[PDB]
Structure 1
Amino acid sequence: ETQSFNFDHFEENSKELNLQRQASIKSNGVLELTKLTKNGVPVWKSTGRALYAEPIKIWDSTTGNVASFETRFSFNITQPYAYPEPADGLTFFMVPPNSPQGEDGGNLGVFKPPEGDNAFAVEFDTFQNTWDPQVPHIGIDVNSIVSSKTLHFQLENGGVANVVIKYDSPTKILNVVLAFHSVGTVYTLSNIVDLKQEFPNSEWVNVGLSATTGYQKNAVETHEIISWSFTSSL
């Protein structure tokens, strides 16, 4: 039937959120995906992911139907400095269960250089790689870091961002909306995605949030997740 988790805030232990690497839960009830310092000294090349414990049912083989989902979350990215040049970004992704971790930096901890695992991600790219358009930008990544579509947006440094991602099985429409209410700005980007086709060998996937800091000293930024709700309708 339906599957829906909601995190008005975050709490340790909570056997619902599965943390990987640098990901951890601050005392603020905030989920910190990456680290800016570790052990007393500055750090970089940090990586963190937070996957939801339960796998989500994307499509059913029996009746050949597909699930229509909607996920919402608030993030706070802060960029300490200008030069070097902050990196790398944040992403919402989906991957088959027990599927290998992605690379660092530009691969937002989700994709691997050699087409390894079917992965789907919605990125918020802060660093311009050799394959990226001006940044920062929103990108719909379908089995590749090379977004199938992108949209440039102004980032409100240290300001709260509201993200809404919606998928309608019937129309195969994936729409992403980014809002910065304080300043009152709205960014909307949509494309066509066929979940069954992009995830042909998996009726179940693990939903998650991922982020990474740069490959060079000080090519970093903060990646905080305040709240996160999701709901699929198969």
Structure 2
Amino acid sequence: VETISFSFSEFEPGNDNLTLQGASLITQSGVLQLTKINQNGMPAWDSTGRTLYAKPVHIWDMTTGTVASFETRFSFSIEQPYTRPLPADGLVFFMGPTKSKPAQGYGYLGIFNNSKQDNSYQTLGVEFDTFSNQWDPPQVPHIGIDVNSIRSIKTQPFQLDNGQVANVVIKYDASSKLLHAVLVYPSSGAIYTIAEIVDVKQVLPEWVDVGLSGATGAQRDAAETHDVYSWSFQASLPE
């Protein structure tokens, strides 16, 4: 069994194991701000930011045919301060090719370039979508499981607790090829759950980068915050 794991109760500026891209930034108070926040303390539009763990993770081995089981936990808060226009765009937990750079922003959440399903992406993502695009279901916000496409294969609407901290748990069992995610708002006690079959062996490359990505809207004030307070990850490749 080879393993890998990190666990941040809070974030520390200048930490080497974290790669910040785009607007992504860590405050001295220990919080990770994926998207830009102005001097007046309010969310800026047309912003994209990502954070990747500096070490690649071995998700599966082509030689032995074994695939790893993994689990990730993080807590974040999304604040939508504007009355109008509609807020955007959301944040995602993703896995993909190592040494990747930010893709398209807005509805693409910084991890995709278009709305076409392209196995060439080799990207798996669990999104918390706050804006309804042409490819999205009517309800927002919604949790979505993205496999090589911004058009989720599965979707689950949820109630946003504006400014409140949400706890997320995403788990993958290699034995059943089952990916289950959970969203919990400690404040209200609300619980949301999504699950779906995902063959990691058919989607991702043997080695991947794990990260978080966030993005704000394409027009003035179509924004919200994407703050992350903690993040842990663990993977186990048997053989």
Equivalent in the alignment of 1:152: 157
Distance in 1, matches of 2:66 and 2:46, equals 40
1:178 matched to 2:179? The reply is: no
Distance in 1, matches of 2:224 and 2:45, equals 9
TM-score, length basis structure 1: 0.95
Equivalent in the alignment of 1:24: 25
Which stretch has the larger CA shift, 218-227 or 97-106? Answer: 97-106
Equivalent in the alignment of 1:132: 136
Distance in 2, matches of 1:128 and 1:41, equals 22
Cα displacement (A) at 1:37: 2.2
Equivalent in the alignment of 1:211: 214
Query: For structure 1, which runs of at least 5 residues remain unmatched after alignment?
Result: none
1:36 and 1:221 in contact (8 A); partners too:
no
1:33 matched to 2:34? The reply is: yes
Cα displacement (A) at 1:102: 1.4
Q: Which amino acid aligns with 2:133?
A: N
Identical columns (%): 59
2:43 and 2:225 in contact (8 A); partners too:
no
**Aligned length, in residue pairs:** 232
Distance in 2, matches of 1:77 and 1:41, equals 12
Cα displacement (A) at 1:82: 2.7
1:59 and 1:67 in contact (8 A); partners too:
yes
TM-score, length basis structure 2: 0.93
Task: Please give the root-mean-square deviation of Cα atoms over the aligned residues, in Å.
Answer: 1.6
Cα displacement (A) at 1:41: 10
1:220 matched to 2:223? The reply is: yes
1:78 match: secondary structure: coil
1:36 and 1:44 in contact (8 A); partners too:
no
2:78 match: secondary structure: strand
